[model samples]
Target chain A: IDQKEKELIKESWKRIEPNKNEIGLLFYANLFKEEPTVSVLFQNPISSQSRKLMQVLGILVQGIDNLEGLIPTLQDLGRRHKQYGVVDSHYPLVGDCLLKSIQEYLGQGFTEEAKAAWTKVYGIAAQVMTA
Target chain B: IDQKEKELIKESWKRIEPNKNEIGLLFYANLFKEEPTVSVLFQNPISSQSRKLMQVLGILVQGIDNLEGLIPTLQDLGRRHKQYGVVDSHYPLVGDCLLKSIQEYLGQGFTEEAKAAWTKVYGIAAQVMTA
Candidate 1:
């Protein structure tokens, strides 16, 4: 939420963009691999869906510093996810997988501050997504 | 820009909600019927695509009074439309068809004030979409 956190997120994202596909694939891999119950929810193929996951992330990154402006979009997204059978418990698991995937791909670029910032941003996003 | 304009726009949209499907179909009918050249851009079926157009309008309505916050979504939409072969000149024609469709349905509800407010909102949206 702070300027520094926003900067950290934006900067780390720029580095991850090149390896975005791998991160996306890894995110799903971690999700289904760790929390296998959530895997049942994603009956469709992950390859194509992974790209969609990254695209949503790209959109969130663009609106990171404007949560007030971004709430409607997030609310819409949450509604759609709810329709797709996503519940409250799924949020944190997905967030954990997402952060882990980013950390796996980022290497040294995923600094302590960057990790903290992403977690906070993801937490805020999850709250919106589950609200 | 004014609160009154936003109120007028929001109220008229609420009236059109029940007839949303009809309005969406008429919008496409007016567009492709009047400007057939643009139809080439839509290779897929219009029936399904019409729903998407309505969904986007719903998002815009939710953010009607917050143009600054809505710019990123508009920019992303514009980028996607551009990829689909939409040009700068095509915007007004689309807006014209939109207004015409709403007018066809709103009847008594589409007063002078509502028309003026919608025109202003669409103009600002067009500028952002084209930017």
Candidate 2:
């Protein structure tokens, strides 16, 4: 939330917003490639699931200024995931795939600092989602 | 949190921190008054227990920015309270008494937004603690 990170997160997110669909696609591809079992947790149609994924990521990233407000929603998501058989141990794999997909999608824009920022965000998100 | 609410939270918290001991003692007094049975859950020396309670509230307040990280720890506290016979029904009573203490301690610093922010925070905490 310092000025540098705020700027870095903003510029980095801008580049990925347009290709978010592909990034979502890339994320699942990377995820299933590494952990095929995770795919079983999804019940939605393929295209709709992708849309949901991208939509959630967008909402989460766009409202970073409202971190506290966002937390309850995040915790709700976590609670719901419990019914889907998601557990605390599953978060890191999702984060790894997310970072991988982001790197693949952004290519040159994925700077060290950008990686750090996204990693920090993902780390927080993962904990909220599964904690 | 909205920027204004974050500002309100920070400013308000700053004003009441030094009196956390009084606030902590008051919370317990109110809690037991409402639910005398809850008093059985504690065995620590009263002075030390009050300090521990105040210390936890301070950490929880200051660490609001890292809310996600706090969730797991709060969940852990929830888990530990299982031994104390703390249950879902008891959480709201604790939150209510805690709020009474906060209101007393904050006095002029407690704005509408401050109450809302803390209420939002307590709702999340109670959910995690008892959910």
Candidate 3:
């Protein structure tokens, strides 16, 4: 991303950092509400798994500045997900749920700029996963 | 995670384990590329830093299943990092770089699921550091 996108992401992340646990819980719960099938892929139960979900999101969000470097990891991760039976559609479903979760958590701070930046990040990740 | 994710990381990590050197070089390089500021965070030379990185990651990957018990030590690490000027944001950046570095070495076998699991492990440590 350009400088503006990077700054927007970094600035907005701090606002959401404290509520990490809550956001993570809702994201998975939101995901499962729509597609319970994906939940089976998790090796841990929901309580532990949702926390894991938040952690992964942190990695993804933090890596936005260095998306170039994070791509291979994302690719490796994508291939791993492929092995675990994650198809193309699953990515967007995740992005949607993730965005909703963040917006729900951030409430007032969830500016349009933040939404745009996060959306771009998911788009960048999808390209790498496909590659 | 169960033995499943732990096994996935452990077993697969072996194939690329041959590139300890490359992983180190690329990880630091990855770190600098994204957050040029953290370039100052290195205590030892790249050679030494990478070795330390390899050791730490080995501990993390191997200890994934047993991660519930790894927190206290990580809190110690965070406190140590604080002494070194590591801000709260630095932890996840380091994690992302480490995971990306692993992906570079693993290439073909890097599964998205494995990355997902590793992401969880990385998240756990970041939490410990932040705690």
Task: List, for all models, the DockQ compared with the true complex.
Answer: 0.01, 0.01, 0.01
TM-score of chain A of each: 0.93, 0.91, 0.88
CA-RMSD of model 1 = 16.9
Name the lDDT of candidate 2. Answer: 0.71
Chain A TM value for model 1: 0.93
Q: A29 in model 3: Cα distance from truth in Å?
A: 1.0
Tell me what fraction of the real C-alpha contacts between chains A and B each candidate also makes. Answer: 0.00, 0.00, 0.00
Writing each residue's lDDT as its tens digit, candidate 2 over A74-111 gives 89888988999998878888888888777866677788
> Number of backbone collisions per candidate, in order?
0, 1, 7
Model 1, A12-120: lDDT tens digits are 8898777676567556544554564565566544545767888878887888878678788889889989988999988877887788767865768788898889899
lDDT to native, each model: 0.76, 0.71, 0.72
- After superposition, the stretches of candidate 1 with alpha carbons farther than 4 Å from their true spots are A1-131
Query: Mind giving the per-residue lDDT tens digits that candidate 2 earns over B1-131?
Result: 66666566677778658666556655654455455566667665343566787677777778777767788888888898887777788877787777766776566667767877877777887777765
Q: If ranked by lDDT, best first, what sequence of candidates would result?
A: 1, 3, 2
Which residue pairs clash within candidate 2?
A68-B1
Off by over 4 Å in 3: B1-131
